[PDB]
């Protein structure tokens, strides 16, 4: 028994309707559905019986396939709150489930004002690449004294805003932000202070 | 809790000629519960080497074993089985017809 | 009912057997033993689908597993166990091959030796007035910096109250010797405020990070300070 | 063979 | 013609601190070809045909390893039972479950079965649909409400009209000389199948007797 999941990862934007397989060419019996955050335990979202069955939990739909070989992971308006690895898992002939690799999602916010910037930060210094739209990819460090993180989502819910940024340093005391940033494709409009 | 009282059946596993080589089997099946005890009689006194089959059951859930033993029938020797269960308070002998 | 695993992170120099626990009172007849790699999906140990009864899954070499009382499952790791330093998940499920429910899991980290485990550094740096001036907005940024292992968990707290708003800690540590086997470890967090917030001297905002370290039982024998589970903060108040 | 799986009643 | 192959279980505990009697036995028509005793200093799935004996060691590991699961299970099952139907430490109790699946002549599906018996009653059974269980009393309706829940029928039906079935045609292959051997009754004497039309004994040569 096998279970293979597609796509590996799925990079969309939120508010986007996507949709996740689980296929085989065996049937099962029975077929779950799990989300799991790094280090934390899975938490099962579903269990389909029957063939052509759809079920509903929050802003996921479950579609088990008419010959049961086959599921699929439907969320309509997706929020980066759905971010995570999905996994589907089959009823095992020898008493356990059968799972599948997984589809790592990554719901990206929708930055609608994009201030690219590249910051310098005071205690020891950081550089701060921030307000960046989610198309911007941090590429990693080139010297092994120079850290550089990859990009976070931020949330300032109060004010409805929400922001990416990168944390760059190094042990240098002649490193500088016009070259901390180096490796990454940064965008044209980014602010840079004297 | 139901409980079923042995059927019995004494015979060989081919006719029965005298001085010729044979097996005396035993039958005891429809029974409930298991613990049975089987013995193969010549002359009133046990046989040695009495072997049987593994317990199974029936659609009905009663059990069934055969106690088979190698034997030369021939003639006057009277054979009989003594069984034993719990829905009988003394063993009871049935005689080995032809 | 629940499934539970403890603790949460598990610290052990390379050589020892240790015990990872799960117990369940849910009164699921099926137990299960699974590891997760980085980055990875989850890998069968170990299962039992009845009391007194368990079974291989597809990487058993070097663990071992008990069934002796329907609600506990415990997994050895021995020595024997080549690759041991991972992220183990227990589960248990009503009757076997039926849906399962996973314990919180458990991070085991297996070191080379003992002297390779170091406490973080932790340091909170002041937002750049260009920033300020440019959108209004005030991003103070948090670093922890050479842990070993990565048991850290990193918390944000403005004025004696932990917040969760305008933060953003990495998904993932980071190596500081990636060559290094056992390489200690850097973290950063961005807590974003309004202007207006930084800018008044009245509020406090600290940055927390519990480790998990060495314990009461360890030998320590260096002359720097015993690495034990603790915490470490940074602070910084607001400056007009 | 036999089933793979088992349940108690 | 018609085959069938089954799988008989049987679980008797015993007064106070003895540990349960567990005997599993295999058919394929009415040819037994494995056992597994409780009482056997082997503790394996033995083979009873000679045309089994022929089996790899992973066959009879695995044999091993999913009758010492259900033995355990039994073991479990004997004490729920003792507690649905309030009774005694004391008194002796038997367990019997039976499964398998019948082949038509084209040896393809032709019907499974999947059922319980307490102290020589009907307990629990998988009905012909392979979808829906018969639950015999009150007691009974507490397994067939965790059964239900726990979607047990589909997986039984997936065993018995697939893999059961598959095992079964391996079965008549491998023992061709012995399980597709048709006797020939003597007037009724040395005849295989029993099934004719005194109960049937078996001869214990492989062949039946029956009397008019």
């Not at chain 1, 095992?92 to 201030?115: A, M, Y």
């Not at chain 2, 009689?41 to 190698?70: A, C, M, P, Q």
């Not at chain 3, 499934?3 to 052990?12: G, V």
């Not at chain 3, 907005?137 to 050479?146: D, E, H, I, M, W």
Request: glycine share 6%.
């Amino acid at each position: 028994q096998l279970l293979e999941q597609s796509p590996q990862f799925l990079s969309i934007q939120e508010g986007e309707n996507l949709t996740v397989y689980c296929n085989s060419s065996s049937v099962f019996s029975s077929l779950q559905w799990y989300r799991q955050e790094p280090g934390e335990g899975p938490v099962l979202l579903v269990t389909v019986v029957t063939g052509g069955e759809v079920k509903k939990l929050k802003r996921l739909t479950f579609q088990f396939g008419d010959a049961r070989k086959d599921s699929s992971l439907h969320i309509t308006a997706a929020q980066p709150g759905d971010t995570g690895l999905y996994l589907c898992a089959g009823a095992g002939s020898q008493g356990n489930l059968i799972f599948g690799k997984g589809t790592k999602l990554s719901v990206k916010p929708n930055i609608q004002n994009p201030d690219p910037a590249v910051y310098q930060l005071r205690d020891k210094s950081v550089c701060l690449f921030t307000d960046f739209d989610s198309q911007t990819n941090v590429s990693q460090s080139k010297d092994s004294d120079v850290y550089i993180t990859d990009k976070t989502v931020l949330d300032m819910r109060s004010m409805d805003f929400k922001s990416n940024s990168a944390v760059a340093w190094s042990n240098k005391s002649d490193f500088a932000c016009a070259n901390a940033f180096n490796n990454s494709i940064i965008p044209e409009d980014t602010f840079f202070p004297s | 809790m139901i409980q079923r009282t042995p059927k019995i059946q004494v015979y060989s596993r081919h006719p029965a000629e005298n001085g010729k080589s044979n097996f005396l089997n035993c039958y005891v099946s429809g029974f409930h519960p298991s613990d049975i005890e089987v013995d193969l009689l010549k002359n009133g006194e046990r046989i040695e080497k009495v072997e049987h089959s593994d317990l199974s059951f029936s659609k009905d859930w009663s059990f069934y074993l055969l106690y088979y033993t190698e034997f030369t029938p021939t003639e006057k020797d009277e054979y009989a089985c003594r069984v034993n269960h719990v829905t009988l308070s003394q063993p009871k002998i049935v005689k080995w017809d032809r | 009912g629940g499934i539970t695993q403890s603790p949460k992170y598990l610290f052990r120099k390379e050589g020892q057997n240790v015990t990872l626990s799960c117990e369940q009172n849910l009164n699921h007849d099926a137990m299960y033993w699974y590891r997760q790699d980085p980055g990875q999906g989850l890998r069968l140990i170990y299962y039992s689908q009845i009391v007194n009864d368990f079974q291989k899954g597809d990487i058993a070499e070097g663990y071992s597993v008990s069934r002796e009382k329907k609600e506990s499952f415990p997994l050895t790791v021995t020595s024997a166990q080549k690759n041991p330093t991972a992220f183990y998940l227990c589960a248990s499920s009503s009757r076997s091959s039926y849906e399962q429910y996973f314990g919180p899991g458990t991070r085991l980290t297996v070191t080379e030796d003992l002297k390779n485990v170091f406490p973080p550094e932790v340091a909170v740096f002041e937002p750049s007035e260009a920033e300020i001036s440019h959108t209004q907005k005030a991003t103070l940024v948090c670093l922890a910096t050479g842990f070993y292992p990565d048991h850290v968990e990193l918390s944000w707290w403005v004025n004696g109250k932990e917040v969760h708003s305008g933060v953003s800690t990495d998904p993932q540590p980071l190596k500081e010797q990636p060559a290094l086997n056992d390489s200690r470890y850097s973290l950063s967090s961005r807590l974003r405020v309004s202007a207006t917030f930084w800018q008044n001297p009245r509020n406090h905002f600290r940055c927390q990070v519990q480790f998990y370290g060495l314990s009461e039982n360890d030998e320590w024998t260096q002359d720097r300070a015993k690495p034990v589970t603790q915490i470490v903060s940074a602070e910084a108040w607001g400056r007009a | 063979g036999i089933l793979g799986l088992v349940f108690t009643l | 013609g018609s085959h069938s192959m089954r799988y008989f279980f049987t679980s008797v505990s015993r007064p106070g601190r003895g540990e349960p009697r567990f005997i599993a036995v295999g058919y394929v028509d009415d040819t037994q070809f494995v056992r597994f005793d409780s009482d056997a200093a082997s503790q394996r799935m033995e083979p009873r045909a000679p045309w089994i004996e022929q089996e790899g060691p992973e066959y009879w590991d695995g044999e091993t390893r999913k009758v010492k699961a259900h033995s355990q299970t039994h073991r479990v099952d004997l004490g729920t039972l003792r507690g649905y139907y309030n009774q005694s430490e004391a008194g002796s109790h038997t367990v019997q479950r039976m499964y398998g699946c019948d082949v038509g002549s084209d040896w393809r599906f032709l019907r499974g079965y999947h059922q319980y018996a307490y102290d020589g009653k009907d307990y629990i059974a998988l009905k012909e649909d392979l979808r829906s269980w018969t639950a015999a009393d009150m007691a009974a309706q507490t397994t067939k409400h965790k059964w239900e829940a726990a979607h047990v029928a589909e997986q039984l039906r997936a065993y018995l009209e697939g893999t059961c079935v598959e095992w079964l045609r391996r079965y008549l292959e491998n023992g061709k000389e012995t399980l597709q051997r048709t006797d020939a009754p003597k007037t009724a004497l040395s005849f295989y199948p029993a099934e004719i039309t005194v109960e049937t004994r078996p001869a214990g040569d492989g062949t039946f007797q029956k009397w008019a």
